[PDB]
Design an enzyme around this catalytic site. Structure first.
Site, PDB file in Angstrom:
ATOM      1  N   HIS A 182      61.098  12.292 -31.064  1.00 35.49           N
ATOM      2  CA  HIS A 182      62.046  12.999 -31.860  1.00 35.49           C
ATOM      3  C   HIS A 182      61.757  12.896 -33.378  1.00 35.49           C
ATOM      4  CE1 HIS A 182      64.053   9.019 -32.277  1.00 35.49           C
ATOM      5  NE2 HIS A 182      64.568   9.534 -33.397  1.00 35.49           N
TER       6      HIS A 182
ATOM      7  N   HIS B 193      62.770  13.752 -38.938  1.00 32.98           N
ATOM      8  CA  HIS B 193      63.489  13.069 -37.845  1.00 32.98           C
ATOM      9  C   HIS B 193      64.417  14.069 -37.288  1.00 32.98           C
ATOM     10  CE1 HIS B 193      66.853  10.589 -36.305  1.00 32.98           C
ATOM     11  NE2 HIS B 193      65.961   9.638 -36.148  1.00 32.98           N
TER      12      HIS B 193
END
Lengths: 158, 158
Positions: free
Chosen positions: B65, B80
């Site tokens: 992620h 992020h």
């Protein structure tokens, strides 16, 4: 100002009761990868968080799950309770300090309702991050196993 | 090495399609408080993430992620995806690059299944953080409203 022990180290006491771990054990790479700084983590067994140093409160997150402090000796510390806890929007967290408060070791900073929190986060592991360490300073854990709130001499900055 | 535009700026393209926001709008104080660095955020409308620069992949989180990159010009960037997404343990995330890969602008880095992710996180807001900015460098957003992947000239480091 700086509070020093019999070895002339600045006093740093356990802020939480539970099990002490190296920062590499936090299951979230922002922390285990030391992206905000070196540190260590505690897996809490009680939900009370106390000041680990004589110093000042710099920042209380709105959700009341993380607190930033600065010791009289100048180290900035961030204590972020649990992993992915902003999702809880504050529920289960109580704050007992405000920004700019002056704190003494063992003074209560926060209280967490573990039973309300535990089910909703992936881990209760709590990082303690030193955010302004000098070039070359590293954190080392001295204690092993369970630590209690207010126990000294649990880590070393070497 | 450094890729520069007609104004001799290093090329920085939108890595995601969606709406551009200042870093102060991310609803998580680790990011809005600029604790890892200054930056900006995008609220995605598509789940594809592409490289915003010519550079190198430094780190692919295990959960896939978040990705860390370094541009040929030396800026380190962390992308992020989403807020509190490590909780998903990787589910809904696909990676198309490995650490040490060299990337060109627009090259696909990740793909996110938004429908699998959306229900489980508090926000899909995605910070783009510059983690090694110089003393005094700030990030400024130039674009406004919706941006598309690969659109240039969306922010400025002044």
């Amino acid at each position: 100002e700086p509070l020093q022990n019999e070895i002339g180290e600045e006093v740093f006491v356990s802020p939480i009761t539970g099990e002490i771990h190296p920062i590499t054990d936090v299951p979230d790479q922002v922390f285990s990868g030391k992206m905000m700084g070196d540190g260590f983590a505690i897996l809490p067994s009680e939900g009370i968080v106390v000041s680990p140093v004589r110093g000042k409160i710099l920042n209380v997150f709105p959700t009341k799950h993380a607190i930033g402090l600065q010791s009289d000796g100048g180290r900035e510390i961030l204590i972020h309770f649990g992993i992915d806890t902003v999702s809880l929007k504050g529920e289960g967290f109580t704050s007992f300090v405000s920004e700019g408060d002056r704190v003494e070791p063992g003074q209560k900073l926060l209280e967490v309702d573990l039973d309300a929190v535990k089910p909703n986060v992936p881990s209760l592991m709590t990082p303690i991050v030193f955010t302004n360490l000098a070039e070359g300073e590293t954190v080392s854990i001295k204690a092993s196993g369970s630590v209690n709130r207010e126990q000294e001499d649990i880590v070393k900055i070497e």
